[PDB]
Structures are given as C-alpha cells and as structure tokens.
C-alpha cells in the first residue's frame, strides 16, 4: 500500500483468500470491514500515528468508532484483487471521519464503498469528550481541505437516526460470546465482530436467497471479554430491510443498534 | 504465490495484518493455520484441482483432516513478511499427507514448520476409504518421488499417539458456538476454528505467560452449524496440556489434542 501523490489519502490491494469467502464463493462483508480495517491501519503508521496523536496519549485520549455504514455493489470473487482508498476528515469539535471507496483492480470501477464515525474518549474513565484545537491542528494536515465525501448525496442512508427495537423481536441469536480470535492486540473485542453478532440473527433463507447490499451500524458501548451478548432482528419491510439489537444476555443492557437492507439474487 | 522450478512445491509470501495479531503484537496460531490453509489452496488451483482429482469427483469423495500439527519457533510481527512453502506427499492406502515449512522473508530463517495428515471419505456417507491406484496416479506426479518430510527426525511429536482426557477436567469453557464467520465457502465448520475452541479452555495467565510452541490435534468428527462444543483441558507436565472437544449434550468426541508451551 501507498499514500497517494498530495498526501491526503492511502491505497492498498488486496487478493481475496479461500477461508475469507462464503457460500457464493465472494467476500464477506466481516472480511470486507477487516480489510476497510486494515487499510485504515495502514493509512495511519504512514504519517506517523499509532489513531493517537501526540497530545493524546499524555491525556490518556482514544479515537473510538461511533458508527459504520457500508455499501457493496459487488462482493470481490476468491482470487479476485480489491483496490481500497481511504481517507480522513475533521467533522469540527464532533469528532473524525474515515471514509472508503472500493474498487475492481481490473475494471477500475467501484464495487462499494464506507464511511465511519469516531469519537474522543478517555481511555480509562470511558467520558466522551469534544475535539479539542491543540488535537485538531496535529491531524489537520493529513486530510484533504475540501470536503471529500464517500457518500455526498443530499438525503443518504449513512446519516440516518436509527431506533431501538421493541420487544418481542421477530428473530434472535442468544449467548454470544467473543474467543480469542475475536479480540484485538489490546485485548478489546475487534468492531468487526459486532457486525457477525447482528447478521447471526438473520435467518439462514435470508442469507441463502438476499444479498446484504447496506448496512448501519450503532456502536454505543463495547462487549467486554467475559460479556455475553443477545443479538435481536425485526422485519422493518423485492427489497428487505430489517432492525437490528445487540444488548447484553442478562441486564438486557444496549452495546449496538442497526438496519440492514439486503436484495433478490 | 507460484510453483517452485521443479513444479513439485509452492510458495507464497504474506504481509502480517493488524487484525491477525495478539495481545503481543505478533500472528496468532490461528493466523498461522489459516495462511497454511490459503497456501494449500493457492497450489492444489496451480495444479488443476478443486482437493479432489477427476475420479473423486465422480465418486463422491473429499479429502478430510484426519491431524494437524504445528511447531512454531518464532511469530512474525505485524507488518512482517512470511514465506510458505508447501508440498504433498502419499501415504499408500492410509492417505496423503500435506508439510509446510515457514521462513522470516527477510533473514531467510525457519521460523515455523508444519505437517497434516488427510484421509480419503465419501461426502455424503462419511465412510473412510483407502486411496485405490486409480485416484493414487492422478495426483503423485505433483508430488516429490523421494521422501521430503518437514518433521524428519525419528520419534519426533508429530506421530505421537494422543489419549482421551478423563472426568473431571482442570480446566473448561461450555457452549461454543459456530457463527458464520467460522463457516467455510461449503457451509462446514473451518479446520481452524477447532484449534481456536481448543485454546479457549488454556487459562488466560498461560496465554499471558507462555508462548505457544506446539499443538497436534486429531479430528475425529466434525461440529455442524447448530452444534454446541465444551472444551476441556488438563495439565500434564515447559507447560504440557492435554484436551477434548466434545458436544455439550451427548458428550460425543469431535478432537483431542496436546499443547506445549514456553516460558516467555
Ligand atoms: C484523526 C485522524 O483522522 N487521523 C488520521 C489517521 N491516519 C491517517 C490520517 C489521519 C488524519
Ligand atoms: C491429494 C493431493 O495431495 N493433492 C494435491 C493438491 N494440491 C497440490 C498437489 C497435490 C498432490
């Protein structure tokens, strides 16, 4: 992978792996947010950072996902090259924003793309809290000036409200609980897991006859290593969306809340 | 990834992703075991398979694991560069057999070696066969003529004969599910996730600890999508574990294991 020629985005391909695909022998969407991931993490060793700036990590500051939204026109066949380019911009004192545009390294034609929101928080306390100047100005000069949007449109699916599912839920997946594998290098369940938890309550005909072309998804608060989860999907609709919720096995506390928008094979 | 010269072994080189790393900042196990896998793909594909020849095709037979072990001397680090190299060899009527031998790109030393062991089964019956000359031809001139064994030594841990863990276990973790992320393009559980549900049952202080050196695991049957496994496992011993996974229900068999751990 490479930053781009003015220095304000990063490129990486990908080959697509035997054990990354599923039953129609293309990506997953689990292996296509790794790899969005992936390049992100790339992106950052690059220019210097860990996300954490340099007054960050005296203040004991993290960049923290609030929410993912992506959408996949095309899932890249096994064997088949992917072509990522992200990108980050300021969204003022909010927080960040990393967005992605995927593409067939053959064609060169786009076959989806992603955007994510991110927040500050202190790592120990877990408080939230705005984007201050001194942050701002030390990663300011590695996004572009202009607004570059993955999804500019006026009326978007990437900055709807979503609501909190209501009991009883049509469909649900109970006991979830995170292993190893599901953990990053600091020990926290890795972002990509949450979205396995939503789409494991999706019945199986669903998946066997639909693709998932969108999907949103709400972090709120994380899944701890010895947490189990209770992952819970209501029909909300040719085309089928649904509501999702990821809350806790025994308080019923909320840690996620999503839609999904799938399509007829 | 490509063939060698002699067109009897493949090597592929793979960058260490962020996600693929532990809490020491170096490639699980089950990265590992998942990139031997992706190279065994990649060259049975240069050679025109798929791992199933033209008669098993028409006879309904897979290959299936039967052991996996591996014995790793070093992890590679995140954005480190490793090169697989893999070959296959027959093992009469048994079997076949399946070696991988994996270097640090830059200084060329092995860091890693590791060998399997497969069995010809129908895919719809699931009962164990001998190879037969027929299927024997059409594969072994992929194969070096001359032995090339990735664990030479005699009486070496590959071939070691594994026992059943018995009631009650030092250690567990109960109701192991599959989601889809461990299934495979066919709908199976993944041969890697056994070794992950087998891990989950080591205490988190070894893992802490200790690094990983070896594990040989046998498959005796294999988990469905709604199954539910415990994992069990009892010190022996350098740390020695043996394990079990079984079904929760029934307390049917499906692997057992052995685990040898270092000091870090
Ligand atoms: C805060 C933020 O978005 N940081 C970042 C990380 N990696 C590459 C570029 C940038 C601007
Ligand atoms: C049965 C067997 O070992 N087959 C194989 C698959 N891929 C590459 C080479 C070979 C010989």
Same mark, same amino acid.
């Given at each position: 992978?490479?930053?781009?020629?003015?220095? !304000?985005?990063?490129? #990486?391909?990908?080959?697509?792996?035997?054990? #990354?695909?599923?039953?129609?022998?293309?990506?997953?969407?689990?292996?296509?947010?790794?790899?969005? *991931?992936?390049?992100?993490?790339? +992106?950052?060793?690059?220019?210097?950072?860990?996300?954490?700036?340099? $007054?960050?990590?005296?203040? +004991? !500051?993290?960049?923290?996902?609030?929410?993912?939204?992506? #959408?996949?026109?095309?899932?890249?066949?096994?064997?088949?090259?992917?072509?990522?380019?992200?990108?980050? *911009?300021?969204?003022?004192?909010?927080?960040?924003?990393?967005?992605?545009?995927?593409?067939?390294?053959?064609?060169?034609?786009? $076959?989806?793309?992603?955007?994510?929101?991110?927040?500050?928080?202190?790592?120990?306390?877990?408080?939230?809290?705005?984007?201050?100047?001194?942050?701002?100005?030390?990663?300011?000069?590695?996004?572009?000036?202009?607004?570059?949007?993955?999804?500019?449109?006026?009326?978007?699916?990437?900055?709807?409200?979503?609501?909190?599912? #209501?009991?009883?839920? *049509?469909?649900?997946?109970?006991?979830?609980?995170?292993?190893?594998?599901?953990?990053?290098?600091?020990?926290?369940?890795?972002?990509?897991?949450?979205?396995?938890?939503?789409?494991?309550?999706?019945?199986?005909?669903?998946?066997? $006859?639909?693709? !998932?072309?969108?999907?949103?998804?709400?972090?709120?608060?994380?899944?701890?290593?010895?947490?189990?989860?209770?992952?819970?999907?209501?029909?909300?609709?040719?085309?089928?969306?649904?509501? +999702?919720?990821?809350?806790?096995?025994?308080?019923? *506390?909320?840690?996620?809340?999503? $839609?999904?928008?799938?399509?007829?094979?």
């Amino acid at each position: 992978g490479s930053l781009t020629e003015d220095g !304000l985005s990063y490129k #990486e391909k990908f080959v697509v792996r035997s054990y #990354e695909v599923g039953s129609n022998k293309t990506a997953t969407v689990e292996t296509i947010a790794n790899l969005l *991931q992936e390049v992100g993490c790339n +992106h950052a060793q690059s220019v210097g950072f860990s996300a954490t700036t340099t $007054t960050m990590r005296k203040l +004991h !500051l993290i960049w923290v996902t609030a929410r993912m939204h992506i #959408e996949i026109y095309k899932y890249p066949a096994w064997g088949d090259v992917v072509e990522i380019e992200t990108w980050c *911009q300021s969204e003022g004192r909010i927080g960040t924003r990393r967005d992605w545009i995927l593409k067939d390294s053959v064609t060169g034609e786009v $076959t989806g793309r992603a955007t994510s929101k991110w927040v500050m928080m202190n790592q120990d306390t877990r408080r939230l809290q705005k984007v201050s100047d001194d942050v701002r100005d030390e990663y300011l000069v590695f996004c572009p000036q202009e607004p570059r949007l993955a999804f500019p449109e006026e009326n978007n699916r990437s900055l709807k409200k979503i609501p909190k599912l #209501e009991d009883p839920a *049509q469909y649900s997946m109970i006991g979830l609980k995170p292993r190893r594998a599901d953990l990053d290098m600091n020990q926290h369940v890795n972002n990509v897991t949450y979205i396995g938890w939503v789409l494991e309550s999706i019945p199986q005909e669903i998946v066997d $006859t639909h693709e !998932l072309q969108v999907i949103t998804l709400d972090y709120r608060r994380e899944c701890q290593q010895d947490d189990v989860v209770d992952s819970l999907t209501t029909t909300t609709s040719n085309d089928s969306q649904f509501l +999702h919720l990821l809350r806790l096995s025994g308080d019923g *506390q909320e840690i996620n809340r999503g $839609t999904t928008l799938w399509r007829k094979k």
